[PDB]
Design a protein around this nucleic acid. Structure first.
Ligand SMILES: Nc1ncnc2c1ncn2[C@@H]1O[C@H](CSCC[C@H](N)C(=O)O)[C@@H](O)[C@H]1O
Ligand SMILES: [Zn+2]
Length: 775
DNA sequence: TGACATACGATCCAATC
DNA sequence: GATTGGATCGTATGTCA
């Protein structure tokens, strides 16, 4: 329970943790002409002051109490009517963005909105500059100095009531959910052409249904469809821990003809899927298998959702990735009706995020920081070439800053200073130094903001929330190329969004490109409902990664993030009405494991049955040792209650009779727990407590302590009178069967419940790998 | 100290009106 | 605009053997 060690920058940004008639003349002469035949100018005198390409003008607004609008000048031209006109791009204020009250008063953000006005209608010319600043760990001490000089000159200008000076260094895209680098070669060309207008024109050209001159094809949503192509159709256009029951995947069809009926209709021939026969057939079949039919449909062009490929089993790719990512299917039967980055992992845990990023090919987890002995031991067991520190991150940061000589840039506690002096010389020799770390990744605690926390204004929750500041100080000190932050969904709305806004403002104060999003794990290949928030940060001359495409059906709506002024952003689509692949069930995950009783402790066992489903075949791999198939022991009364709950979908504590139980030691208890009928009707009746899983459903969210009378509940096996084992809980989060956990059973459950799914980490790392090849 | 069992609030957001 | 269900890497307290 140690308070965070920050740099001065983070301390100053947060401040609430440890320490607080007019004559209009064309200047010069034209330098070219617009295609319409209009002279272009570079400078103009308005009211005695100079308006130039690269400056800013203010336009007047209706309501008086609102501040005027600022526009960046792109070009000036003289039209046929001899009217003096300019084109401008909108410069938004930081207070009108997702930053809110955390934004600077002098910082403006460039947008893709445009304007064209006459020079008579401008109110004034503003003092404006574009800030381009070098990137590196070797410049941050110089950047501090200038920044101080910039702050002082501001307050004096404020106390004398002088005009404000503005600067711009980023571009705000609310439809991409982020702040991006300025395209410096496309702005201020003083030419009649503008890139934002070109973007809008191309956008409006790509929303129309147009036929090819040969009626052999058609353009829709920016995709070209030809005859004999394979296409996706919504299932509706042709015809608890479980809500994917009856959610169907895309229908795969071959396009045969274009029917005239310019309006037209399409003719398709459909394929069938293994789950269109039975659930037993879908259990034993591959996810990429289809069946041939002769059934033909006539559809409107708007029923098509994308293109795919259908091959033979022999011609399939020989690379097998667990998140499939491939739009390729195979048909056999018939249906009769180089760039590896040096990575520092902070708050490493057991290593799921690392595991995925290492499988993607972008990270070598060279250093890791984990204060818990069993978790550090597990990380060392699974990643043997990594240097693991089993200290507090505050102590490690203090030691690194002492090694660099910047003790006076560090804000720390006496306790952390004393603990940093106790490190041995070999430990201090192995610490990373700035200029050696290219990637920083980490999942700060998820307990301060989680909604399940009844006590969030207590002393323990506040420090866990405060670890964000230490995580940001690591990025401030090391200035890496790439930065990845992971947390819960409620991190973006914790206390009216202030923590999210302050994190974004801190990342922007250093000079990063930042983007944010929320992702659902079940759409990427796990049988779980897990909603997580991700933040990407990149250097000004890097490419900021995109988001991975979800390819599994899962019944979750649009995960949205609130952007101020009534706007919202969604990172990915909803797969509830259709997706390339079917959902993963509980029987797909745990249906091949052998039977165990209550409180089994044998750690090393043997597999008895072979893998049947796709998920089983690819989680087992080539492993012959079954490890950690162990469950927690329930007492006599809880085991009596567990055996008396039916093996039906949706069975919970409401199925327990009102009765008195005599135990072995002559105690008389009551079968129904007193707390469950007491606080009900405030909590939706506690559905799923003492609840059994459904074979055709999915798992609930993986928590650190699975117990029958918890908030989440539903830890009972669908058929066996026990709680789920460690291996089953690791299979629900996507861990391979060869992954090793350390400690007692409680520590292993804690390690599994805290992790990022390795499949989702691999999906994110693949997009980072694509971003690294585009530089 | 530790292990294990019990008791249990407020906010956000999408269907259904 | 109104109001219901559903969501969900939990924390504090008391007994105990
Ligand atoms: N201050 C801190 N320093 C290092 N690891 C920490 C930490 N707080 C939490 N962790 C660990 O990081 C993960 C979250 C868990 O493994 C947790 O034990
Ligand atoms: Zn324009």
């Amino acid at each position: 329970a140690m308070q965070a060690t920050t740099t001065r920058l983070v301390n100053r940004i947060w401040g609430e943790f440890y320490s607080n008639k007019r004559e209009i003349k064309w200047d010069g002469e034209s330098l070219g002409k617009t295609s319409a035949g209009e002279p272009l100018y570079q400078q103009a005198l308005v009211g005695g002051e100079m308006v130039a390409v690269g400056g800013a003008v203010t336009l007047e607004v209706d309501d008086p109490d609102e501040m005027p609008a600022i526009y960046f000048v792109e070009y000036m031209f003289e039209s046929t009517d001899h009217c003096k006109m300019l084109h401008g791009r909108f410069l938004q204020r930081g207070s009108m963005t997702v930053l809110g009250n955390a934004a600077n008063e002098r910082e403006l953000f460039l947008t893709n909105e445009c304007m064209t006005t006459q020079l008579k209608d401008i109110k004034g010319v503003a003092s404006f500059e574009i800030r381009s600043r070098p990137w590196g760990h070797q410049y941050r001490k110089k950047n501090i100095t200038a920044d101080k000089l910039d702050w002082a000159r501001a307050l004096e200008r404020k106390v004398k009531d002088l005009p404000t000076e503005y600067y711009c260094k980023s571009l705000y895209s609310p439809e991409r959910g982020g702040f991006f680098s300025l395209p410096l070669s496309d702005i201020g060309r003083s030419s009649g052409f503008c890139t934002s207008c070109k973007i809008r024109e191309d956008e409006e050209k790509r929303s129309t249904i147009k036929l090819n001159v040969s009626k052999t094809g058609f353009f829709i949503n920016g995709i070209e469809y030809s005859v004999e192509d394979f296409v996706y159709v919504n299932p509706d256009s042709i015809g608890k821990s479980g809500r994917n029951i009856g959610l169907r995947a895309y229908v795969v069809c071959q396009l045969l003809e274009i029917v005239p009926k310019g309006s037209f209709d399409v003719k398709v021939r459909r394929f069938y899927r293994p789950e269109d026969v039975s659930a037993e057939k879908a259990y034993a079949s591959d996810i990429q298998e289809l069946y041939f039919s002769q059934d033909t449909v006539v559809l409107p062009p708007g029923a098509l959702e994308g293109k795919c490929e259908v091959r033979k089993k022999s011609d399939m790719p020989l690379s097998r990735e667990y998140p499939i990512s491939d739009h390729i299917f195979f048909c056999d039967l018939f249906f009769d009706t180089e760039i590896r980055l040096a990575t520092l992992d902070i708050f490493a845990g057991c290593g799921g995020l690392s595991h995925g990023l290492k499988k993607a090919g972008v990270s070598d987890a060279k250093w890791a920081i984990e204060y818990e002995e069993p978790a550090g031991q597990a990380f060392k067991q699974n990643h043997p070439e990594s240097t693991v520190f089993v200290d507090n991150c505050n102590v490690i940061l203090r030691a690194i800053m002492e090694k660099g000589g910047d003790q006076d840039d560090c804000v720390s506690t006496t306790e952390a200073n004393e603990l940093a002096a106790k490190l041995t010389e070999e430990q201090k020799s192995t610490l990373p130094l700035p200029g050696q770390v290219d990637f920083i990744n980490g999942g700060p605690p998820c307990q301060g903001f989680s909604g399940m926390n009844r006590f969030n204004q207590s002393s323990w929750s506040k420090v866990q929330c405060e670890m964000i500041l230490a995580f940001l100080s690591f990025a401030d000190y090391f200035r890496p190329r790439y930065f990845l932050l992971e947390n819960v969904r409620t991190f973006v709305s914790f206390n009216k969004g202030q923590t999210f806004q302050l994190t974004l403002a801190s990342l922007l104060e250093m000079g990063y490109q930042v983007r944010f999003g929320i992702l659902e794990a079940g759409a990427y290949g796990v049988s779980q409902s897990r909603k997580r928030a991700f933040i990407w940060a990149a250097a000004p001359e890097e490419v900021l990664p995109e988001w991975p495409e979800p390819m599994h059906v899962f019944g979750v709506p649009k995960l949205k993030i609130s952007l101020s002024q009534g706007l919202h952003y969604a990172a990915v689509r909803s797969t509830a009405l259709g997706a390339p692949f079917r959902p993963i069930t509980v029987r797909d995950t745990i249906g091949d494991l052998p039977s165990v009783e209550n409180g089994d402790s044998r750690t090393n066992k043997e597999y008895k049955e072979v893998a049947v489903s796709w998920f089983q075949k690819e989680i087992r791999g080539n492993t012959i040792a079954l490890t950690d198939h162990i469950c927690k022991a329930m007492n006599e009364l809880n085991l009596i209650r567990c055996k008396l709950i039916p093996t039906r979908p949706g069975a919970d504590w409401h199925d327990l009779p009102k009765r008195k139980v005599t135990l072995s030691d002559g105690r008389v208890e009551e079968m129904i727990p007193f707390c469950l009928p007491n606080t009900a009707e405030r909590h939706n009746g506690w559905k799923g407590l003492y609840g059994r899983l459904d074979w055709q459903g999915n798992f609930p969210t993986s928590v650190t302590d699975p117990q029958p009378m918890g908030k989440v509940g539903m830890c009972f096996h669908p058929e066996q009178h026990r709680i789920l084992t460690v291996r089953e809980c690791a299979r629900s989060q996507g861990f391979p069967d060869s992954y090793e956990f350390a400690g007692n059973i409680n520590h292993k459950h804690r390690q599994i419940g805290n992790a990022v799914p390795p499949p989702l980490a691999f999906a994110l790392g693949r997009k980072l790998k694509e971003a690294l090849h585009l530089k």
